[PDB]
Design a protein around this ligand. Structure first.
Ligand SMILES: COc1ccccc1[C@H](O)CN1C[C@@H](C(N)=O)CCC1=O
Ligand SMILES: [Zn+2]
Length: 140
């Protein structure tokens, strides 16, 4: 589990969104595994606006932050889970790292700010849903 709190937005994995998220919906995209809801309180996270390919992510199944090298956002085939059919997930970045299904939500960050959140993985892989192209998270 986990979310990004930027401005008056909450960014979560679409597959982990709550009823309150769906009842206060700003935007959702199944192909990216992302959903954004509105918040009453202002958040403290800042979004990175860059093309970094190195950063650090939080892994809840190890209580640890790991430094990683990761691929550029791409269209990558993801194996069937309890949330999605085997399919093509867009704007996904992969790295070598430990990951398990409850780790979705952990933040990946670079020197510029938050890059994205854990969305996939398995066999020493971890996939991150990028958020750096969502420029509207910085306003309104
Ligand atoms: C962190 O992910 C894992 C970890 C260990 C093993 C397998 C995985 C999966 O890739 C994660 N997965 C895919 C998600 C998606 N974005 O399509 C939907 C829900 C899900 O369980
Ligand atoms: Zn960066």
């Amino acid at each position: 589990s986990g979310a990004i709190y930027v401005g008056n937005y909450r960014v979560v994995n679409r597959h982990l969104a709550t009823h309150n998220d769906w009842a206060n919906l700003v935007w959702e995209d199944s192909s990216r595994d992302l959903l954004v809801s509105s918040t009453t309180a202002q958040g403290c996270d800042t979004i990175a606006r860059c093309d970094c390919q190195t950063g650090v992510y939080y892994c809840s199944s190890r209580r640890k932050h790991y430094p990683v090298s990761f691929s550029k956002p791409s269209l990558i085939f993801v194996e069937a889970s309890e949330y999605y059919p085997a399919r093509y997930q867009s704007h996904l970045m992969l790295a070598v790292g430990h990951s398990e299904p409850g780790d979705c939500g952990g933040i990946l960050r670079c020197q510029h700010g938050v890059v994205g959140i854990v969305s996939t993985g398995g066999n020493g892989l971890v996939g991150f849903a990028d958020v750096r192209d969502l420029l509207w998270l910085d306003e309104e």
